[PDB]
Each structure stands twice: as C-alpha cells, then as structure tokens.
Paper text:
We also determined the structure of PAM4 amyloid fibrils formed by a lower purity (92%) peptide batch. The most abundant polymorph, PAM4 Type 2 (representing 28% of the total population), was resolved to a resolution of 2.8 Å. This polymorph has six peptide subunits per layer with a helical twist and rise of 358.55° and 4.8 Å, respectively, corresponding to a crossover distance of 60 nm. The resolution of the maps, in combination with liquid chromatography-mass spectrometry (LCMS) data, facilitated the identification of an adduct coming from a minor population of the peptide containing an N-terminal Fmoc protection group from peptide synthesis (~7.4%). Interestingly, the folds were interchangeable within the different fibril types, with Type 1 contaning FoldA and B, Type 2 fibrils containing FoldB, C and D, and Type 3 and Type 4 fibrils containing FoldC and D. FoldB PAM4, which has a flipped N-terminal compared to the previous fold, perfectly matches the 4R PSP-derived tau fibril cores and shows a C-terminal mismatch to the 3R PiD tau polymorph.
In all cases, the folds share a C-terminal β-strand (residues 358–362) but differ in the way they orientate the N-terminus about an intermediary GS-bend (residues 355–356).
Numbering used by the authors:
A (entry chain L), B (entry chain R), C (entry chain F), D (entry chain K), E (entry chain Q), F (entry chain E), ...: 350 to 362
The structure:
C-alpha cells in the first residue's frame, strides 16, 4: 500500500 | 495498491 | 504500508 | 495449505 | 491448497 | 498451515 | 478447508 | 482449517 | 485451526 | 465444518 | 468447526 | 472449535 | 471483499 | 475485508 | 479487516 | 480494496 | 485496504 | 489498512 521496491538482490560477479 | 517496483534482480556477470 | 526498500543484498565478488 | 495471499517471492540461484 | 491470491513470484536460475 | 499473508521472501544461493 | 497430505518436501534455492 | 500432514521437510538455501 | 503433523524439519542456510 | 444444528425452528404467531 | 447447537429455537408471539 | 451450546432459545412476547 | 461468505441468517418478525 | 465471514445471526422482533 | 468473522449475534426486541 | 461510503445507517430489531 | 466512511450510525435493539 | 471515519455513533439496547 503506497510502497516502493527499488531492488532486492544486486548480485555482481 | 498504489505501489511501484523498479527492479528485483540486477545480476551482472 | 508507506515503506521503502532500497536494497537487500549487495554481493560484489 | 501451502498457499499465499498478497506475498512476494524472489528466489535466485 | 497450493494456491495463490495476489502474489508475485520471481524465480531465477 | 505453511501459508503466508503479505510477506516478502528473498532466498539466494 | 479440509486437507490431507502424506509427505511434503519444500526445497528452495 | 483442518489439516493433516504425515511428514514435512523445509530446506532453504 | 486444527493441525496435525507427524514430523517437522526446518533447515535454513 | 463437521458441525451440527439439532433443529432450526423459528415460529411466529 | 466440530461444534454443535443442541436446538436453535426462536419463537415470537 | 469442539464447543457446544446446549440450547439457543430466544423468545419474545 | 464486502460479501457475506459462509454465514447463516435467521431473521424473524 | 468489510465482510461477514462464518457468522451466525439470529434476529427476532 | 473491518469484518465480522466467526461471530454469533443473538438480537431480540 | 479502495472503498468509499458516504454514510452507513444500520438498524437491527 | 484504503477505506473511507463519512459517518456510521448503528442502532441495535 | 488506511481507514478514515468521520463519526461513529453506536447505540445498543
């Protein structure tokens, strides 16, 4: 409800 | 409800 | 509810 | 049983 | 049983 | 039983 | 809800 | 909710 | 909620 | 669920 | 759930 | 849940 | 949502 | 949500 | 939420 | 759910 | 749930 | 839940 997600996982090899 | 998703996974090899 | 997530995991090899 | 309501799953391997 | 209502699944391999 | 309501799961391996 | 399960295995990666 | 389960294994990585 | 489980194993990594 | 009502009797004069 | 009501009786005169 | 009501009786004159 | 689900109504006048 | 779920109503006048 | 869940109402006048 | 109600009058006899 | 109600009057006899 | 109510009057006889 009126929320945001930018990123959950940022997996950089 | 009135929410946003920008990105979940950003997997860069 | 009116919350934000910037990032959960930042896994840099 | 083994159900979901309003959930978010981000499964990565 | 083994059902979903209003969910988001992001499964990556 | 073994259910979810409004949850977020981020499982990484 | 009436449910019967003989055996349940949840494996997540 | 009435539930019956013989055996339950949850393995998470 | 009425529940019956014979054996329950939760393994988390 | 697995319930009983011995008699549902509503009389108005 | 597995309950009883011996008699549901509502009389109005 | 596994409960009883011996008699539900409401009379109005 | 905004419904009458699994209910019993006994209205007398 | 905003519902009547699994309820019994016995209204007399 | 804002509901009547698993309730019994016995209203007489 | 995005509900709007102007006015709700409920009388039970 | 995003509910709005102007005024709620409830009378029970 | 994001609820708004202007005024709630409740009378029980």
């Amino acid at each position: 409800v009126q929320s945001k997600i930018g990123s959950l996982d940022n997996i950089t090899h």
